[PDB]
Amino acid sequence: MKQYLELMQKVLDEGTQKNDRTGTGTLSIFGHQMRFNLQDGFPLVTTKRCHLRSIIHELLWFLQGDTNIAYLHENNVTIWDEWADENGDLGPVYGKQWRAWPTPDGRHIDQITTVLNQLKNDPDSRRIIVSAWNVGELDKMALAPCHAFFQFYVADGKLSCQLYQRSCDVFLGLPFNIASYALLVHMMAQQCDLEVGDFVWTGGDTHLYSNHMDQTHLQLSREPRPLPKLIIKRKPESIFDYRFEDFEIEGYDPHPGIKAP
Amino acid sequence: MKQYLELMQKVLDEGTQKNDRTGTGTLSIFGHQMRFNLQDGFPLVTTKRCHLRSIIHELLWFLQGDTNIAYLHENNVTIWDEWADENGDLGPVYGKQWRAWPTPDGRHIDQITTVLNQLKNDPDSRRIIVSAWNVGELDKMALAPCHAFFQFYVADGKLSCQLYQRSCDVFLGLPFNIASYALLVHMMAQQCDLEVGDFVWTGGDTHLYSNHMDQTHLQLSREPRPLPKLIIKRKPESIFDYRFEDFEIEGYDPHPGIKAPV
Ligand SMILES: *SCCNC(=O)[C@H]1CCCN1S(=O)(=O)c1ccc(C)cc1
Ligand SMILES: *SCCNC(=O)[C@H]1CCCN1S(=O)(=O)c1ccc(C)cc1
Numbered sequence: 001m002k003q004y005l006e007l008m009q010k011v012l013d014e015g016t017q018k019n020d021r022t023g024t025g026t027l028s029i030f031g032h033q034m035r036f037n038l039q040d041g042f043p044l045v046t047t048k049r050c051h052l053r054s055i056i057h058e059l060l061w062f063l064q065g066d067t068n069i070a071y072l073h074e075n076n077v078t079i080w081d082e083w084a085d086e087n088g089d090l091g092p093v094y095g096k097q098w099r100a101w102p103t104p105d106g107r108h109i110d111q112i113t114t115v116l117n118q119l120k121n122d123p124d125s126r127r128i129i130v131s132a133w134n135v136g137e138l139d140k141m142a143l144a145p146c147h148a149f150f151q152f153y154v155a156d157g158k159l160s161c162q163l164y165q166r167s168c169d170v171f172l173g174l175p176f177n178i179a180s181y182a183l184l185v186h187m188m189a190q191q192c193d194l195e196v197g198d199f200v201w202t203g204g205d206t207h208l209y210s211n212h213m214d215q216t217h218l219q220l221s222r223e224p225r226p227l228p229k230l231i232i233k234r235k236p237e238s239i240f241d242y243r244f245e246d247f248e249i250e251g252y253d254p255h256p257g258i259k260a261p
Numbered sequence: 262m263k264q265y266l267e268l269m270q271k272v273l274d275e276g277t278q279k280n281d282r283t284g285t286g287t288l289s290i291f292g293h294q295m296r297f298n299l300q301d302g303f304p305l306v307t308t309k310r311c312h313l314r315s316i317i318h319e320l321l322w323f324l325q326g327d328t329n330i331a332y333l334h335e336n337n338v339t340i341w342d343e344w345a346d347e348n349g350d351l352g353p354v355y356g357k358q359w360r361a362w363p364t365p366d367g368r369h370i371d372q373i374t375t376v377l378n379q380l381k382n383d384p385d386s387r388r389i390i391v392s393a394w395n396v397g398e399l400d401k402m403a404l405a406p407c408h409a410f411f412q413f414y415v416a417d418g419k420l421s422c423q424l425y426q427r428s429c430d431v432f433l434g435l436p437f438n439i440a441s442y443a444l445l446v447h448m449m450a451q452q453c454d455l456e457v458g459d460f461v462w463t464g465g466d467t468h469l470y471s472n473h474m475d476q477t478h479l480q481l482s483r484e485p486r487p488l489p490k491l492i493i494k495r496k497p498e499s500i501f502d503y504r505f506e507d508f509e510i511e512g513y514d515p516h517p518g519i520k521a522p523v
Contacts, residue, residue, distance in 0.1 A: 016416040016417060018385045018416070019385055020385065020387075021386075028416075030414040030416070030421050030423065030459070030461065031294065031296060031421070031423045031459070031461035031463075032294075033292065033293075033294035033463065035292060101396045101397060102365040102397075103365070103397035104363050104364070104365055104367070104397070109396050109397060111396060124279050124280060124281075124282075125282075126281075126282070126427065126428040126465075126466040127399075127405050127427065127428065129394070129427060131392070131394045131396055131410075133390070133392050133394065133410065134396070135362045135364075135370050135372060135392055135395075136362060136363065136364030136365055136366075136368070136370060137364070137365065138388075144388050148390075148410075149392075149394065149409075149410060149425065151427055151465045151466075153291040153465070153466060155277040155279065155289070155291065156277060160291050160292070162291065162292050162465055164410065164425045164463070166387065166388060166390060166412055167387035167388065197291075198291070198292065200291065200292030202292070202294060202425070202463050204387070204390075204412045204414070204423055205387040205412075205414055
């Protein structure tokens with residue numbers, strides 16, 4: 001995608017060399033922002049084939065508030081496998097915070113249900129937010145949230161969303177995360193009877209891993225193609241009732257996928 | 262400042278006309294990002310006179326974990342007065358969250374002490390963050406946080422900081438908030454023996470209130486002056502021991518103050 005390809009190139013040209021906790025190096029920058037007008041097409045990177053299948057199952061798993069990978073396993077999604085414990089648990093990562101943020105008095109807060117009621121009853125609210133950054137539960141998580149907080153906004157019947165991504169693997173994670181949130185916006189817009197607006201992506205520590213440089217050079221020699229179009233084939237009863245077969249991507253014509261370690 | 266006037270101009274050229282929570286109309290954009298290299302100068306708006314006095318007191322108060330206006334009111338800082346209850350309490354706003362975020366198991370997390378230790382011992386960490394966005398306590402606060410979350414970053418011996426401001430009053434709030442965080446970056450950097458890098462500002466709902474329009478256009482007819490320079494006179498034993506008198510601004514030569522209703 002043009003903005004994506006400019007970000008890759010910016011890391012290459014201005015990133016500084018760092019070490020990470022794994023001893024693998026990176027090139028990184030701090031602070032970046034991109035905007036995707038979702039009416040221009042679904043923002044799925046076309047300079048490498050990206051499979052939506054795992055993206056879609058993970059989003060639906062998040063919305064059910066499940067943090068055990070059994071559901072992912074039933075549908076052959078393995079992106080979370082290395083962080084799960086012997087029981088398949090991740091601790092209270094994304095899903096748990098989205099649907100049942102734990103309060104000190106034993107109660108839970110459903111942030112998605114709050115956001116839907118804010119979109120439907122108070123769309124101009126300036127606090128239509130979902131945070132996964134539960135400071136009190138970071139030590140229990142298998143991984144601290146990378147797509148840490150997001151905010152919705154309504155203008156002229158269009159639903160926009162901005163994501164603050166505190167840590168971004170530009171090659172591997174970013175195309176996946178852009179798609180995931182673009183999808184959620186389409187689903188929310190549909191449940192609130194709104195049109196789709198912008199997906200604003202803001203990065204904190206934004207990097208390219210050292211072992212992703214050949215792959216990055218390959219990707220930057222390719223030209224982007226027109227974006228595909230998302231089709232939701234069935235409008236369910238609520239935001240918690242989507243199924244994998246409700247989504248279709250049309251006109252997706254990417255270059256061959258690029259594998260990365 | 263250049264970045265600040267460019268944002269005002271973007272809100273006027275692109276913003277959507279809507280209404281705030283109390284009706285008071287707004288022009289708003291969604292999503293913005295700007296950067297201030299702190300080595301170029303302390304980012305205190307010059308196109309209207311801004312008083313650093315109150316910004317300093319507020320930050321020293323936040324850093325103590327205080328949420329009662331008494332310290333502010335004694336020092337003639339009245340910006341939080343309208344939100345305070347009859348006992349001067351604001352609820353567990355900013356400072357409480359920063360210094361003692363309450364966990365489910367009964368612990369409290371001191372996010373400022375954590376970030377200081379992560380800057381001294383693991384400066385390349387990708388989670389050197391402070392969040393005031395405590396979902397479980399938002400409705401106990403007098404106001405939900407507007408400068409909601411911030412992250413630090415270290416490169417080439419310089420400390421940078423990015424703030425996510427979910428709701429931004431561009432004319433009244435923003436000049437204050439930029440100066441507040443640039444001061445925090447300076448304090449933290451001093452404490453970790455680092456040099457200052459960039460303050461990165463990101464906005465969510467970024468608006469101009471309709472009754473600030475003539476003031477905004479007035480300000481937009483002026484040229485930004487050279488940035489003032491911040492002199493910290495002492496190196497306290499910790500980030501929690503700074504005093505009002507440790508801070509001096511030099512070379513501040515602003516255009517006239519422009520009053521406006523909150
Ligand atoms: S800061 C990145 C840390 N890793 C993650 O959070 C992983 C765990 C599985 C989901 N995410 S991801 O960054 O969205 C991702 C998705 C797909 C691949 C191939 C890698 C990483
Ligand atoms: S989203 C803005 C909501 N209002 C506030 O949080 C106020 C209360 C006092 C501090 N803040 S402020 O926006 O930083 C501010 C500071 C100074 C003035 C003159 C107005 C507002």
